Design a binder for this molecule. Structure first.
Ligand SMILES: *Cc1cc2c(nc3c(=O)[nH]c(=O)nc-3n2C[C@H](O)[C@H](O)[C@H](O)COP(=O)(O)OP(=O)(O)OC[C@H]2O[C@@H](n3cnc4c(N)ncnc43)[C@H](O)[C@@H]2O)c(*)c1C
Ligand code: NA
Ligand code: NA
Ligand SMILES: [Xe]
Ligand SMILES: [Xe]
Length: 490
């Protein structure tokens, strides 16, 4: 009725979709990345708005405030729980979908760029490349991830040891707050600008665009991928890795992927084969690396190479909006501060990763720049002392095959509890996991006590400052979801 009435006064009607609209199913599904959340049993938005101008976003928020219809914002749609376009329980909401606002304006000489939230990471990276072969930006690894959610929740990838997370390399933003007002760094103040850069999506307003500093990379980088089965000595090698990798020079990141009794060591090095080989021989000879393992290429070519194994298809891999990969998926994460006993590595490789519904485990080492930033300097607290992060990933491809992978995910998380961080058990906000806890709503406001349960896991000692900031910029909890920062007020 009147919410829609208000929208049509301010926004071109071709940018508005109701459930009855012919294109609604298509617009809704276009950036859903998880087949668990696309099916008809999921709660759907009442309306979808696809702005092309910032004034459309402002109008949508004003209308929502006036008619008390809450808005969930979607940029790339990768939210692991789908909270950008679905709710867990029946309720009325509109989705503001930013996929049409996708400009990237790079200033090569100043080494800065303005990037719309609706741009995907691959589009950002590709625009940086068109400006310079020796500039980069340290955000996620997956090209179809949206800038908006990736930066809001922190954002890290293969440059994290060198340059930290995306959010700490953001120098300004353009944001629409809960009253429809347009803000930048100057107008929003220290607290709000601190919170929005890593404090998770949705909670602190709709970010329209981000200004980033662009960072130097050499014209040639080197990648290798070396696998070790357990008979090839994987357990002893990974047991050494967990101590060595966090301490390596910042130019060298060695992550691990495991999906059975075999570990694949994937390395990105900001330099040439010529200097890498002696570094490896000196610091990590157990891996058995030699020049035949090296793949030299530009930074921009390393993005599809690391993620997909592709060397030959830059535009197709980075500029892709077909949305073809739509697994059913479950995810969990952990942080590790103390080395695992060799027996735990034996169990993970020989036992947990050879079970029905077993998934994939990805291990990213910290240390260096990401660990040098104080824990409270940004909302992202997983810094000093971190050896590595773990992501537990489960994919399946048929609707009725969820039981086994969901059970595995729960069981291995229980198994790992004694060896990972605790009090709280830390997790990465952008690896969203609703089983960590969800909000309770009382008198139409999310409660501080329910928020704290999962909030301390994502944000540790930063959670209370996030909530106090929330209370100042959005006391009525307009921008929320089931796992958004609750307001903490007078
Ligand atoms: C699907 C997927 C996710 C990945 C992948 N690899 C990652 C990597 O290498 N590094 C990472 O740091 N993260 C990786 N992730 C996780 C993604 O970073 C997260 O899933 C991001 O949150 C996704 O962002 P986006 O694609 O924009 O997802 P949405 O579902 O639109 O939003 C997430 C969340 O944030 C809110 N939000 C969106 N847009 C905005 C704006 N503009 N302002 C404020 N808040 C925003 C949403 O409401 C929602 O709550 C690899 C793959 C394949
Ligand atoms: Na702890
Ligand atoms: Na989940
Ligand atoms: Xe806000
Ligand atoms: Xe969050």
């Amino acid at each position: 009725e009147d919410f829609l009435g208000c929208l049509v006064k301010e926004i071109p009607p071709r940018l508005l979709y109701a459930k009855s609209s012919p294109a609604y199913p298509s617009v809704l599904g276009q950036t859903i990345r998880n087949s668990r959340w696309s099916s008809p049993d999921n709660v759907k938005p009442l309306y979808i708005i696809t702005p092309t101008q910032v004034s459309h976003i402002q109008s949508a928020v004003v209308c929502g405030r006036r008619h008390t219809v809450r808005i969930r914002v979607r940029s790339g749609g990768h939210d692991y729980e789908g909270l950008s376009y679905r709710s867990l329980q029946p309720e009325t909401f509109a989705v503001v979908d930013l996929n049409k606002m996708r400009a990237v304006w790079v200033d090569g000489k100043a080494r800065t760029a303005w990037v719309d939230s609706g741009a995907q990471l691959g589009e950002l990276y590709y625009a940086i490349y068109k400006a310079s072969p020796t500039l980069a930006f340290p955000a996620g690894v997956c090209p179809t991830v949206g800038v908006g959610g990736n930066f809001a929740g922190g954002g890290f990838g293969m440059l994290l040891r060198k340059y930290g997370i995306a959010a700490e390399n953001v120098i300004d933003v353009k944001l629409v707050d809960a009253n429809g007002k347009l803000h930048d760094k100057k107008s929003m103040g220290d607290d709000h600008f601190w919170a929005v850069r890593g404090g998770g999506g949705e909670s602190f307003g709709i970010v329209v665009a981000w200004q980033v500093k662009l960072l130097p990379v050499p014209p040639t980088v080197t990648i290798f991928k070396i696998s070790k089965t357990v008979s090839e000595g994987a357990v002893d090698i990974i047991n050494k890795w967990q101590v060595v990798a966090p301490q390596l020079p910042a130019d060298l990141m060695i992550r691990i992927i495991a999906q059975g009794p075999k570990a694949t060591f994937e390395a990105m090095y900001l330099g040439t084969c010529k200097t890498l080989t002696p570094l490896m021989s000196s610091k990590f000879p157990e891996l058995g690396m030699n020049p035949s393992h090296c793949n030299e290429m530009s930074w921009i070519q390393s993005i599809p190479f690391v993620h997909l194994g592709h060397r030959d298809a830059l535009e197709d891999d980075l500029l892709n909006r077909q949305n073809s990969f739509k697994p059913f998926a479950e995810y969990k994460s952990d942080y590790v501060y103390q080395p695992f006993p060799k027996t735990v590595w034996e169990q993970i490789l020989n036992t947990w990763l050879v079970k029905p519904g077993a998934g994939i485990m990805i291990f990213d080492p910290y240390g260096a720049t990401i660990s040098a930033t104080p824990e409270s300097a940004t909302p992202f607290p997983h810094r000093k002392g971190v050896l590595f992060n773990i992501q537990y990933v489960n994919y399946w491809f048929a609707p009725g095959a969820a039981a086994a992978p969901l059970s595995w995910s729960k069981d291995i998380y229980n198994y790992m509890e004694p060896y990972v961080s605790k009090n709280p058990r830390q997790a990465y906000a952008n690896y969203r996991d609703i089983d960590l806890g969800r909000n309770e709503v009382v008198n139409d406001v999310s409660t501080y006590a329910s928020g704290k349960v999962w909030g301390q896991k994502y944000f540790k000692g930063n959670f209370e400052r996030l909530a106090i900031t929330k209370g100042k910029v959005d006391p009525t909890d307009y921008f929320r979801n089931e796992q958004s920062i609750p307001p903490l007020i007078k």
